[PDB]
Amino acid sequence: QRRLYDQAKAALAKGNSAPYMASRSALRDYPLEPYLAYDELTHRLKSASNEEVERFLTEHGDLPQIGWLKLRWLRLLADRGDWKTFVNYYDPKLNFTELDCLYGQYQLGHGQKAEGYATSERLWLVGKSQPAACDTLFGLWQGEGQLTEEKVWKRLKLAAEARNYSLASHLAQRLPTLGNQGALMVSVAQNPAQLSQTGRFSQRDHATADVVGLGLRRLARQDPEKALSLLDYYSSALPFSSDEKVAIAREIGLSLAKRFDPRALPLMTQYDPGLRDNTVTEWRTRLLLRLGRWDEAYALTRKLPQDLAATSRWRYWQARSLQLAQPNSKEPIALYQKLAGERDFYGFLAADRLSVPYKLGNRPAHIDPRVLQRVRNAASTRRAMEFFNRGEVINARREWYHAARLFDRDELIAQARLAYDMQWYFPAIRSISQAQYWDDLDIRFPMAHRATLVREAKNRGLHSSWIFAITRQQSAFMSDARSGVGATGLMQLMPGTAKETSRKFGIPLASTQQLIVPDVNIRLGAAYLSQVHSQFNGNRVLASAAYNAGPGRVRQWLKDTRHLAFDVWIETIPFDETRQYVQNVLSYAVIYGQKLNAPQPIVDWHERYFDDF
Numbered sequence: 266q267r268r269l270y271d272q273a274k275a276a277l278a279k280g281n282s283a284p285y286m287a288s289r290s291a292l293r294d295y296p297l298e299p300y301l302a303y304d305e306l307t308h309r310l311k312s313a314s315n316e317e318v319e320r321f322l323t324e325h326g327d328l329p330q331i332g333w334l335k336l337r338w339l340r341l342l343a344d345r346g347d348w349k350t351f352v353n354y355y356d357p358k359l360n361f362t363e364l365d366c367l368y369g370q371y372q373l374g375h376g377q378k379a380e381g382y383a384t385s386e387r388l389w390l391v392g393k394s395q396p397a398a399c400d401t402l403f404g405l406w407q408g409e410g411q412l413t414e415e416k417v418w419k420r421l422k423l424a425a426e427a428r429n430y431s432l433a434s435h436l437a438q439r440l441p442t443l444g445n446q447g448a449l450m451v452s453v454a455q456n457p458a459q460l461s462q463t464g465r466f467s468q469r470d471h472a473t474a475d476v477v478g479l480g481l482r483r484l485a486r487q488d489p490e491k492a493l494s495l496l497d498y499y500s501s502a503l504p505f506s507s508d509e510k511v512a513i514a515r516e517i518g519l520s521l522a523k524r525f526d527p528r529a530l531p532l533m534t535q536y537d538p539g540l541r542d543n544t545v546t547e548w549r550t551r552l553l554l555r556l557g558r559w560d561e562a563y564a565l566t567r568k569l570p571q572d573l574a575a576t577s578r579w580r581y582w583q584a585r586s587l588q589l590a591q592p593n594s595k596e597p598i599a600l601y602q603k604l605a606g607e608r609d610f611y612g613f614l615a616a617d618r619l620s621v622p623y624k625l626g627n628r629p630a631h632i633d634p635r636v637l638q639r640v641r642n643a644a645s646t647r648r649a650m651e652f653f654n655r656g657e658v659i660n661a662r663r664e665w666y667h668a669a670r671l672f673d674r675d676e677l678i679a680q681a682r683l684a685y686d687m688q689w690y691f692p693a694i695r696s697i698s699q700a701q702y703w704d705d706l707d708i709r710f711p712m713a714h715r716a717t718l719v720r721e722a723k724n725r726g727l728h729s730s731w732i733f734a735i736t737r738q739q740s741a742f743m744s745d746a747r748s749g750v751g752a753t754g755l756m757q758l759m760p761g762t763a764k765e766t767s768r769k770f771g772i773p774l775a776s777t778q779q780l781i782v783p784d785v786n787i788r789l790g791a792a793y794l795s796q797v798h799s800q801f802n803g804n805r806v807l808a809s810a811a812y813n814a815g816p817g818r819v820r821q822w823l824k825d826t827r828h829l830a831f832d833v834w835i836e837t838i839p840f841d842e843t844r845q846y847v848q849n850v851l852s853y854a855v856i857y858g859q860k861l862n863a864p865q866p867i868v869d870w871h872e873r874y875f876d877d878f
Contacts, residue, residue, distance in 0.1 A: 268295055277304040296647040299325045303334070310337055315350055322354070327645060329667040332359045343367045348375070362388065366399035373405050382411055389416065392423030394432050414442060418472070421447055425454035425479060443472050450476040457484035460495055467502050474503040482516045489520035493528060511536050515545060522548040523839035525555045540568055547573070550582065555837040559590035580604045581611035585618070585832065608703070610848040613855060613867040614832060623855060623867075627706035630678050640679040643668065653687065665692045669699060678702050685711070691743040710856050713742040714755070717787045719861070725795040730865045731805055732791060734853035735812065738846060745781040754780040756790030766793045806831055806872045809850045814843045826876035831868055834875070 270292060273285040285301050292298040306313060306321055318338055325331065335354060340363070342351045348371050355368045366388055372381030385406035388399055406412055417439055424433035430451055437447035453459055453466075457480040460466055466477050477499050485492040496513060499505070505513075514536035521529035533549045540546040546569065553562035566574075566583035573579050584600035591597075598619065605615035606624050616623050640646060645668035652661030665684070669677060677700030684693035685708045697708050710733075718736070722729040739757040740746040752759045758766070758780050767774040770792040780786050793812070800816055801807040811819045822838060823829075835851075838844040851867055858865030 266291070268292060270295060270297060270301070273301050277301060277308065282308070296644055296651050299328060299648075300330075303328060303330060307334060307337065310334075311341060315347075327668075329663050332361075335359060336361050336364065339364055339367065343370070363396045363398045366396065366402045369402040370398075370405060373402075373409070378409075382406065382409075385411065386416065389420055390423065392420065392425075392427040392432070393429055414440065418443060418447065418475075421450065422475065422479060425450055428454070430455065446470075446472045446476055450479060453477070453480035454483065457481070458488065458491070460484060460499075461491075463495070463498055463502070466499075469502065469504055471504050474499075474505050474509065477503055478505060478509050478513055481513050485513075485516040485520045489517050489524070490526070492517050493521065493532070515542060518545060519548055522552045525552065525837070527552075527556060540570055543570075543573055546570075550579070551837050554582070554586065554833045559586045562586035563590050577604060577607050577609050577611040581614055582836070584615065588618075589830075610852045610867070613852060617867050625706065625856065625859060626704055629682075629705045629707065630702045632678060632682065633675070636675055637679045637682070640672070640676055641683065646680075646683070650687075653689065662692065665696070669696055674700055674702075678705075681705070681708055691741050694741045706856065706860075710737065710853065710860065711742065712860060714783050714787065717784055721787055721791045725791055727791070727795060727798060728854075728858070728863065728865060729861045730854040730857040730863060731850075732787075732794070733857035733861070734850045735790075735794065735809070736787070737853050737857070738849045744783055744786075753777060754786035754790070755783060756786055756794075758786060758790050758793070762793060763789070766796070770796075802871075804872050804875060805854070806835065806847065806851065806868065807875065809847050810838065810843055813846045814838075814840060818843075820877070823875070823877040825878070827878050828874050829876055831873050831875065 268288070268291055270288065273288050273292070276282065276284040282305050285305055289298070292301070302321070303325065306318070310318075318334075322331070322335070335356070336359070339351060339354060342348070342354075351367070351371060355364055355371075357365060357368075365384070369381055369384040369388060372378075372384055385402055388395060389403055389406070389412075403412065417436055421433055421436040421440070424430070424436060433451050433454065434448075437444065437451060440447045453476050460477060460480045466473065466480075481492045481496060481499065484495070492513075496517065500510065514532050518529045518533040518536070522533070529552055530549065533545050537545045546565075550562055550565045553559075553565065563583065563586040566579055566586060569579055580600070581604060584597045584604065587594065587600070588597040601615040601618050604612060605619055605621060606612070607615075608624055608626060613623050645664050649661045649664035649668070652658075652664060665680070669680060672680065677696055681693050681697035681700065681702075684690075684696060690711045690713050693708050693711070697705055703709070712733075714736075718732045719729050722732050736742065736755050740755045742755065744755060745753075746755070746757065747753060748757065753763065760777065763777075763780060764774060766789050770789070772788055772792070774780075774785065774789060794808070797808045797811040797816060798805070801811060801819070807819055807823075810822075818840075822834075826834075835844060835847055838847065854865045855867055
């Protein structure tokens with residue numbers, strides 16, 4: 266018989282356990298019964314035995330919520346001094362700092378001082394406020410004289426580095442000697458342009474170098490031309506260590522390079538000759554490409570340490586910097602050939618650079634039906650399916666991922682095909698992508714909301730593939746999706762942009778929680794898409810960037826250009842978030858162009874050269 270278990274579900278959070286106990290003889294089969302038992306135990310947790318919690322931890326250890334029980338239970342264990350049972354279940358990979366610190370306490374009270382000192386110092390040297398357990402640990406750690414001036418100074422630095430100046434200030438007011446330079450650090454950290462006053466910061470001690478160094482690093486981010494000028498002064502004037510000095514040059518160099526300033530080149534060149542910092546290594550090359558310096562760019566691309574030389578990026582830019590530098594040479598067509606077989610952005614360029622067609626190569630992986638049935642007979646699946654069939658997506662979704670925590674490369678691919686078959690495309694994309702079987706393109710690039718999208722493309726004169734590309738990149742088809750600063754929907758329409766876009770074009774919205782609707786979200790998103798499309802002369806390369814980065818930023822990234830190669834421009838976008846965003850959308854469009862029977866090339870004829878001239 267089937268069971269309306271909600272009755273028991275209502276009872277527990279909040280209230281009593283009576284209906285659950287009543288129904289527990291029936292629900293022994295049902296896969297969601299463990300969620301009730303869980304909630305049952307948790308509401309009476311402080312009273313329950315070890316043996317009972319341990320019995321539950323074993324037999325329902327697979328549940329998503331189980332780490333919270335571990336946390337709640339371990340708190341108690343420690344708060345009674347039941348440390349034997351504590352260390353039996355303490356696990357750093359739960360990533361609760363409260364526990365880490367409690368395990369820190371345990372160490373100090375059980376002989377393990379080397380382990381506790383290093384455990385304490387690891388949790389100390391961290392520039393955010395840590396949980397109230399860690400106070401107790403830093404207390405014991407302090408009590409054994411380990412909390413020296415040096416280390417309180419170092420956490421002060423990390424705090425100011427993170428802009429958490431309340432913690433920074435608190436710590437500066439715990440510096441027996443360096444009370445001054447510590448306060449002076451927070452002032453520089455807050456306004457690094459203060460270092461214009463070279464007399465007021467020229468006291469040749471190791472702590473004063475520490476503040477100017479922090480200052481110069483932050484100042485670089487927003488006024489790099491000033492930090493470069495001030496670095497020439499402070500280097501002679503102060504006791505900068507060798508590696509204190511390089512991390513200043515890094516910041517300035519990267520900051521100058523993102524503004525296409527050639528004075529980055531001599532700095533980066535001297536201060537990281539070995540190519541030990543991959544980001545400098547990447548941006549020196551990027552900058553050479555922007556400045557049109559192909560001969561030099563090509564030289565950097567041979568020096569790359571293998572893990573960069575490996576990437577399909579620098580494989581391309583070795584072939585292309587060469588070709589720009591030596592136009593008549595044939596050596597590049599060899600290298601493009603090696604690379605043109607891949608199914609990524611730089612791969613498509615390589616194929617586009619040889620005039621030969623793209624290599625998509627859809628071929629679903631070799632699957633075992635023992636593996637498919639084993640994963641369907643895992644309880645997590647049966648649970649997640651049950652949440653989906655009931656219609657609580659957040660639950661069903663949560664189960665899928667916490668099961669995907671420890672499936673091997675064979676097993677993850679089973680999940681993906683199980684999900685794709687249920688018209689549930691986002692878990693299918695997520696599961697397959699963590700399995701890394703890239704070649705399944707019916708799962709990775711599905712034809713979701715195709716009714717809505719194909720129509721809304723023609724509505725506003727935009728190739729269908731470009732909308733599929735943008736949506737797939739922005740949400741991976743997750744009808745209700747949200748970001749770390751709060752963009753809403755399939756086309757990640759921003760709260761700000763959401764309302765205005767509606768008014769200006771001629772369709773009416775309702776709210777924040779009306780951008781979950783597909784036919785809403787997709788309609789006004791496609792409007793804003795065409796707005797920028799037109800804003801930049803139907804150039805998807807620029808417009809796609811604008812959709813993510815803002816037209817204002819994209820205009821900024823065109824001062825003052827002249828016949829810029831499209832591929833150089835994409836590479837020389839200062840933001841890493843935006844560069845990758847653009848490369849995906851372009852490449853996704855190629856894939857969707859195929860699947861919608863309408864060949865999109867990576868770049869259109871008129872997208873290839875552009876400027877603000």
